[PDB]
Amino acid sequence: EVQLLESGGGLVQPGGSLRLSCAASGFTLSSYQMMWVRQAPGKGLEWVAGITGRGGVTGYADSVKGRFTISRDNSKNTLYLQMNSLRAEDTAVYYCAKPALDSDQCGFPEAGCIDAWGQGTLVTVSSASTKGPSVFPLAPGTAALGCLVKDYFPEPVTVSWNSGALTSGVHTFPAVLQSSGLYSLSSVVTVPSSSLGTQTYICNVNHKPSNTKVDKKVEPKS
Amino acid sequence: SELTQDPAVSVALGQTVRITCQGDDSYYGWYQQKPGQAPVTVIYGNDNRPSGIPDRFSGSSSGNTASLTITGAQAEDEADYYCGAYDSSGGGGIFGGGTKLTVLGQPKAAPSVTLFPPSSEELQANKATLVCLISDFYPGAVTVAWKADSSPVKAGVETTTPSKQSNNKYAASSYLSLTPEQWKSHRSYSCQVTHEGSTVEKTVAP
Amino acid sequence: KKVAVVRTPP
Numbered sequence: 001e002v003q004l005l006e007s008g009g010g011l012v013q014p015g016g017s018l019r020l021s022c023a024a025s026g027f028t029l030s031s032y033q034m035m036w037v038r039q040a041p042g043k044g045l046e047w048v049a050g051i052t053g054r055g056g057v058t059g060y061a062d063s064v065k066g067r068f069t070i071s072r073d074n075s076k077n078t079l080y081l082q083m084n085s086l087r088a089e090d091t092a093v094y095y096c097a098k099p100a101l102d103s104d105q106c107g108f109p110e111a112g113c114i115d116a117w118g119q120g121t122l123v124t125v126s127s128a129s130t131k132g133p134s135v136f137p138l139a140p141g142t143a144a145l146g147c148l149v150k151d152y153f154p155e156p157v158t159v160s161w162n163s164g165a166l167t168s169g170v171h172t173f174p175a176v177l178q179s180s181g182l183y184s185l186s187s188v189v190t191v192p193s194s195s196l197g198t199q200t201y202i203c204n205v206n207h208k209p210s211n212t213k214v215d216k217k218v219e220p221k222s
Numbered sequence: 223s224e225l226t227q228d229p230a231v232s233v234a235l236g237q238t239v240r241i242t243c244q245g246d247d248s249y250y251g252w253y254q255q256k257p258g259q260a261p262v263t264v265i266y267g268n269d270n271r272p273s274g275i276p277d278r279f280s281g282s283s284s285g286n287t288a289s290l291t292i293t294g295a296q297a298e299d300e301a302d303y304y305c306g307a308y309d310s311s312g313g314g315g316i317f318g319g320g321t322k323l324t325v326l327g328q329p330k331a332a333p334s335v336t337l338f339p340p341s342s343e344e345l346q347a348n349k350a351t352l353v354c355l356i357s358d359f360y361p362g363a364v365t366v367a368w369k370a371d372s373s374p375v376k377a378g379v380e381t382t383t384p385s386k387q388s389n390n391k392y393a394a395s396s397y398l399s400l401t402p403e404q405w406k407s408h409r410s411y412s413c414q415v416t417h418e419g420s421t422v423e424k425t426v427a428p
Numbered sequence: 429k430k431v432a433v434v435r436t437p438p
Contacts, residue, residue, distance in 0.1 A: 033432065033434075035315060037315070037317075044304065044317060044318075044319045044320050045253070045255075045261065045304050045306070045317040045320070046317060047314055047315030047316065047317065050314070050315065052434065052435060052436050053435075053436075054436060056435075056436025056437075057434055057435070057436055057437075059313055059314055059434070060314075061314055062312075095260060095261070100263075100266045100267065100270065100272070101267070101430055103432060103435065104431070104432055104435070105429075105430040105431065105432055106430070106432055107308075107432040107433040107434040107435070108315075108434060109308055109309065109313055109314045109315045109433065109434065110249060110307075110308045110315070110432070110433060111251060111306035111307055111308065111315030111316055111317060112248060112249045112250040112251035112266065112267065112268075112305075112306045112307040112308060113249060113251060113266055113267055114251050114253070114263055114266060114306060115263050115266050115272050116263070117253075117260050117261050117262065117263070118260065119260055120260050134347065136341045136343045136344045136347075137341055137343065138338045138341065138353055139338075139341065144336040144355070146338070146353075146355075148338075148341070148344070148351065148353060150344075150349075150351070171355075171357060171387060171388075171393060173355065173382060173385075173393060173394075173395045174258075174382050174383075174385050174395075175382075176380045176381075176382055176395065176397055178380060184351075184380075184397065185395075186353055186355065186395060188336065188355050188357075221342075249430075267430070308433060310433070313434070
């Protein structure tokens with residue numbers, strides 16, 4: 001099967017540079033014209049850059065022309081996007097996009113011919129610095145227990161329960177962007193009330209921007 | 223050029239919905255995007271449905287108008303649909319502003335409200351947050367009101383926009399930030415969640 | 429036949 005997988009995303013300062021990478025599997029990159037699409041938070045899809053099969057022609061959106069450079073390594077089955085002199089308006093999830101038809105049929109700006117999309121990589125262009133989260137337990141027929149992941153930056157935070165073994169009844173709520181510019185979220189798992197004193201519930205918090213991994217045991221109040 | 227689509231559209235569960243896109247002389251793509259996810263191609267090249275996409279999704283392109291038809295609308299079709307095409311003037315790719323599709327007629331579900339008082343660890347870290355978790359409700363519109371004693375709370379309230387759960391019911395969070403002093407000084411604190419005229423209340427005391 | 433709108437010039 002066709003798979004597109006991007007990396008290179010992260011927090012960067014205004015005026016800074018970031019190199020995005022897209023690794024293609026399940027097909028030969030050289031047979032396809034490729035493109036980059038981006039999406040600002042709560043905003044629509046926007047075409048960024050495009051490249052031909054051998055990289056003879058490149059194309060860029062008006063707003064990124066001169067700062068961004070789309071390139072490809074057919075030998076490595078990888079598409080790149082060097083993003084220089086970055087601004088706050090460049091903050092978006094960046095997707096790698098593959099046309100359904102080969103280089104002879106679908107060109108890089110033909111945004112109506114896309115059949116495969118990447119997982120996306122978040123680019124945060126802020127003057128703010130990385131902040132690790134503070135994890136607090138939300139103590140409990142059925143009892144609702146969870147853990148509060150407070151004051152972190154930037155997104156994301158992933159919360160698993162009992163090293164991912166506990167999946168049923170789990171709901172990790174979307175984060176709240178406070179007036180301070182920091183995020184906070186909560187993950188709640190519904191468990192049997194009879195098991196509370198005999199069983200252990202641990203939330204596994206992971207904040208990749210600060211390389212933070214917190215395991216918090218959520219036990220009943222005293 | 224640019225692509226024009228209506229920001230929103232609604233369809234009753236099991237019925238047919240037609241999403242239109244307006245552009246000139248193009249080869250159109252239709253991309254489904256769910257809130258937390260990457261987009262998915264439902265149609266490309268006006269009518270080509272990728273294998274794995276249910277045949278309830280069909281694409282048609284008439285003179286200067288693209289159309290995505292969804293016959294027998296299901297709960298899982300509730301998503302953002304973007305049209306893509308080519309801008310020959312500029313030489314780049316173009317997208318419509320998207321069409322958020324709301325699949326109505328799902329069973330009206332009452333919200334399950336769970337209120338949490340500040341933890342011991344958070345109070346030692348000289349902080350107080352009241353966590354009000356609202357889950358399992360349809361439609362996805364709730365108005366949260368916080369009460370200090372018997373009085374409505376004006377400041378320190380942060381509420382997440384309602385988002386869909388795994389089971390297709392909705393969910394939202396409301397956080398009340400206080401000083402450990404403000405938490406202790408009152409007898410109790412209430413989370414009033416209004417969903418379709420009916421109010422569900424939960425109370426926490428120090 | 430579908431032909432790409434852009435390619436490397438010959």
